[PDB]
Enzyme design. Structure first.
Site, PDB file in Angstrom:
ATOM      1  N   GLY A   1      19.201 -17.751  26.466  1.00  0.00           N
ATOM      2  CA  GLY A   1      18.774 -16.364  26.449  1.00  0.00           C
ATOM      3  C   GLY A   1      18.731 -15.800  27.855  1.00  0.00           C
TER       4      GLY A   1
ATOM      5  N   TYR B   1      27.280 -21.622  29.220  1.00  0.00           N
ATOM      6  CA  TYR B   1      26.005 -21.440  28.534  1.00  0.00           C
ATOM      7  C   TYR B   1      25.634 -22.676  27.709  1.00  0.00           C
ATOM      8  CZ  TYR B   1      22.490 -19.125  25.501  1.00  0.00           C
ATOM      9  OH  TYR B   1      21.353 -18.761  24.815  1.00  0.00           O
TER      10      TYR B   1
END
Lengths: 514, 514, 513
Positions: free
Chosen positions: B61, B54
């Protein structure tokens, strides 16, 4: 040619804000001047006759049982202002502080306060100047403390504020504003330190701000429909007639007007369609929109009816005499003693409006949540980003910020339910109206920021859906987006939006989409 | 010179506040520097190996399903800061903003964030300088937004604040504080924009302020007893032993110490008195004090136990790694993805502390209400005035102001219960911990103002009861009043108290009576 | 029936066992000896005519009126009389008994002066199947409810049987084989004192929260098995990085629930090495939404709040909250102070109430995600069975869960509403009893929300894995099978209100084991 508001007996909320905001001068009508001169004389007679009157021949609060001789009245009223000047906290903003001064003036203009010509002139001079007294926002239980600070300011013993909030010391204020120092030699101090002037001033500014935000709420709901192929039948006048709440009827009518000329909304009434055997199954979309669109008339309408009640009550309060004691213009008795200074009306209406504002802000927040959700926005980019997805997140951050602002609004409830016996139990019940009006103002400020985010999102969404040319968009919609684009550029790539959100919010509170 | 805090793994709340307030400089211990260099190397490998992580190879998100090529990571992380910088509202104060920077640094120091040496040096430099980043207080749901604004500031693209709150533009800040512009070329942006740094920073400042206000609450309750012939037997250690709450035992012991040496309090144990027929009748006073004195150990004690819990949880949070993703030092896996950034712990403890602060502020407010009431203060002047009664009202205005401040505190409740699904439903539950900590801070500020009013009232009451020489007053009581009188004169005649209340409140938040 | 021997200390579980009738109560010899010694001390205090509140003085501000020994019986009789102004629904059977127990534990410390007979009356009540019928409202924190308790024990107030059915005073004494309370020793203040009501309410809250917490964990786990949740978010390594006890415990319990499951995703995403060809948009993101990914952090904060609540309550339950009190060491005849001020239970109850609301919010969002066809990864909309449209499944129940949560949010902390009362003598009050009661209401709503989530999950598990629950963990299988013994699958729409209510009652008293 700066407009002029002539004050006689009654002034409406718009006129009041025009003066408070410096958009209009204020002049006392001849009949008002005469009523005031007569009252000034009545106060003189009350003093001359040594009538038993609060603040003229008695101490204050529970100390009123201590009677005072005429030769000590100057000292009595001087210390009244002194002991009351215990306020703290950030000062009221320029417009609000001036609204407070105006509220006191309107009460005095009814001719039952005994204020001398000079005292009235000091209030008028302040309002016609570019200044405002610098008064702490906290301290009153509902409004002697802030008004006492106002008195000190007008005497040159307190700071002043310019339109930008920059503070000037007492001397500089009187100088720059070409004001005369307040003289209370006529023993009319109670004409200035009395009533519900502060909460009323705060509330009248709230009323004005809510009118504009309500217009934006309607304008943005309409634009939202143009970005999501919203159905207009839910906004039909026929529905309003079936459930005749004035605010709902108005909301629906205003929504219809906003999308007039739009080719982006769905106007077909679903019940007109006749279904056959081959239609049974699962359609791509339901025949009705989600509540943030379909129930807009009902939600906005309830908020508008709350604002209408708030304004009706506030209009009476603004034009009333909330002083104690009071000197009957009819000469029936020398003076009356009661409790017209108890600000329970503004307290309850401010709390009710605060709830409505939170509800409407919730609507706007959910509209943002739907518009930015790729699973719900019918084909629009996730978070309305431009440029490569992932590398760009668009309004993803701003959407969360809107939620955060709303959550904070919800944490604060009504101020009125917190009455606490004080003043040696003499003030065993208090209104807290000033606090109520201030808490409502904070919610109004948050609502403005949420609407600003929704506005920026919609400008982008309109261009993404209909192209930069806004093909199919209503005339009203086009005008709004074009107006925004004059100061706020498209989001072609991610950039900090905080300062833009704040700047737009300031605009929404003072002007409507027209 | 200046004390130094050497950061390795653990730092306590006092050390943290010392650094945040500029009282102490900070240095990274060699072992910590090495753990961080090791983590810096792991991040490099993770990036080289193109691991699915990530913020390194994915969007943010819900957009994380959009994978990103390594060639665009610089842009990916630059836009991360951009879209998150949507904050609004007043900036965090100097100390609090620095506390936020410190919180992020402590997390990084654990060696699992991958932050580069330069990045760590930029945080340390800021903390050792006299500056703080100017970051908006609102926007996060709990703390990417405020941290993104921090990053911009550290890059010279945002304002800085000096100890006074005056703002400096980015360039001026880096120049004045001799700070090098933040360089994220190592792709370690997530080491700066992550965790619960803001709410943790706000909470650590809250913890420090409450310690001081708690000391004042104790000192003033003790002085109140000396002004109202309070009964010390209610504060007996024997009672603490019977109901062993640590906070209560501590409060009682501290109260006893404050009045040690006093000849103004009643020390007799009423049960020692043997009654006879001649004693049966009505005595002037009851044998026990009203609750604001008698139950002080229990009320203050409950507040102290709440603060103790808050501090235990906060100490763990401050010294933890609230980052996501994280790079395990043992090298078991390239990285771990979870939710340690969810600030529910600080959210719940801040809300609990806020309630405790409101309760203790209520105690102080009732102490003022009793002390100033001529029917309850056992012979003292009404509202502790000096000069002729009526012509003077003393602290009558200040007493109402205290009530107004308390009523306002009560209007705001817990922030934690307002979670709203956001971020396209990805963040379907949020902590609102930053809001919770900020609301608690506001209540703490109101409590300081109420205590300030109580302190000024007590200084006057002590002199009215015992004379200017404070005959019979305890050594601690004498020292407290004498110290107050060094800056705050006796109220010989009514005068505005607002500015003095505000000035004293600022002092109470930073120093204790010793 | 197990027996709890009370000497000095009793833990929350033992207290609930006695209050709920699961265990008998016996006063240990050492406690009986200490109490007899205290009884003797009270006798001496009275003989010596010492100035003591309630023995030689009036009450509240009227304590300045000194009373002659010959009038003490009337004095204490009227104390009970003027305090019995309570109103509102009566406390439930278990809670009323918990209040009786809390007073007894305080007395057992040996500083209250209670007579052997008075102690026996409390023990008898607890060993019977009855509870005093006491109004829930009236106290500012707990004389009013305790005064009502005294009237009940004297046969002048109603009693409640386990089912809540009311019996008049006379019937109560007869059916429960209870002797009428006799206060001839002038030990009335040993019964009308302290924080017994709020403490009893709070200990029942503590027990209920332990069970609901177990369900919150079990259902979060089953949710992961129904939505292919990622277990790496629950890794012990993450707990170690942010060492909050409650979080570590929550994560460990979650991992245990899904042990043996083939329905969850256990792969660590960072293990995957990406290629240029993989760059683009994948079907799903590498991390779950917060209702699953952040479960350890949310549940954990709630658990740490409950742990604090329980620490404070344990001290309160085992303390002497009486006033006045008679020092066992004989240092002074009696002490006068304010140990009856229930600020500790007030603050912990308010804090727990907030935590319960937060956790109920988590369960509500889990329901909202599970029933949403756009978010439940392939499951039917609202988990319906039969023809869609003709059947809506749990659509109604999902809205009900939201309504329950919204109502919980409307009520805040009770502690901040102190109002000076009793002619300003009680100028600050704790409101601890109200705080504990408001927390109980929230706990009841949480149970209902969890019940809805449980019924939804049983259906979702069968829809995803078939009636045989293939791939489901042993713990998940056991939970669903247990539910199915009393709650049939939803094959066609039917009213769920009564089932939700019935299951909620179960969740409050038992955990998924």
């Amino acid at each position: 040619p700066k407009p002029a508001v002539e004050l006689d007996r009654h002034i409406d909320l718009d006129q009041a804000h025009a003066v408070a905001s410096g958009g209009a001068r204020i002049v006392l009508a001849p009949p008002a001047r005469d009523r005031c001169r007569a009252s000034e004389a009545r106060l003189g007679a009350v003093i001359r006759e040594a009538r038993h009157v609060y603040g003229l021949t008695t101490g204050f609060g529970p100390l009123a049982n201590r009677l005072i001789s005429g030769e000590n009245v100057r000292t009595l009223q001087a210390n009244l202002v002194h002991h009351l000047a215990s306020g703290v906290g950030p000062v009221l903003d320029w417009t609000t502080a001036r609204a407070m001064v105006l509220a006191r003036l309107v009460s005095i203009a009814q001719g039952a306060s005994g204020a001398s010509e000079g005292t009235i002139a000091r209030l008028i001079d302040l309002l016609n100047s570019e200044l405002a007294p610098a008064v702490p926002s906290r301290g009153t239980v509902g409004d002697l403390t802030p008004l006492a600070h106002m008195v000190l300011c007008l005497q040159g013993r307190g700071d002043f504020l310019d339109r930008d909030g920059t503070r000037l010391d007492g001397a500089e204020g009187l100088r720059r504003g070409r004001l005369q120092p307040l003289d209370l030699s006529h023993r009319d101090a109670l004409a200035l330190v009395n009533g519900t002037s502060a909460m009323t001033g705060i509330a009248l500014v709230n009323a004005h701000a809510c009118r504009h935000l309500g217009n934006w709420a309607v304008a943005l709901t309409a634009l939202l429909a143009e970005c999501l192929r919203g159905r207009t039948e839910a906004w039909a006048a026929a529905l309003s007639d079936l459930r005749p709440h004035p605010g709902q009827k108005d909301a629906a009518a205003r929504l219809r007007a906003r999308v007039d000329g739009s080719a982006r909304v769905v106007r077909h009434v679903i019940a007109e369609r006749r279904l056959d055997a081959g239609d049974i199954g699962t359609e791509p979309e339901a025949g009705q929109d989600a509540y943030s669109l379909r129930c807009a008339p009902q939600v906005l309408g309830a908020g508008f009816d709350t604002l209408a009640w708030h304004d009706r009550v506030l209009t009476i309060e603004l034009n009333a005499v909330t002083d104690n004691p009071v000197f009957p213009p009819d000469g029936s008795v020398p003076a009356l003693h009661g409790g017209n200074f108890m600000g329970q009306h503004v307290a309850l209406t401010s709390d009710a409006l605060a709830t409505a504002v939170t509800v409407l802000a919730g609507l706007a927040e959910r509209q943002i949540a739907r518009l930015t959700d790729e699973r719900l926005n019918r084909g629009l980019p996730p978070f309305l980003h431009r440029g490569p997805a992932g590398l760009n997140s668009g309004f993803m951050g701003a959407q969360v910020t809107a939620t955060a602002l709303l959550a904070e609004m919800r944490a604060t409830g009504p101020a009125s339910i917190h009455s606490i016996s004080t003043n040696a139990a003499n003030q065993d019940v208090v209104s807290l109206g000033t606090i109520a009006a201030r808490l409502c103002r904070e919610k109004i400020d948050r609502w403005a920021e949420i609407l600003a985010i929704l506005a920026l999102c919609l400008a982008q969404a309109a261009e993404l859906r209909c192209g930069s040319g806004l093909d199919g968009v209503s005339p009203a919609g086009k005008k709004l987006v074009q107006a925004l684009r004059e100061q706020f550029p498209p989001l072609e790539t991610d950039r900090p939006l905080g300062q833009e959100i704040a700047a737009l919010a300031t605009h929404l509170l003072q002007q409507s989409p027209v």
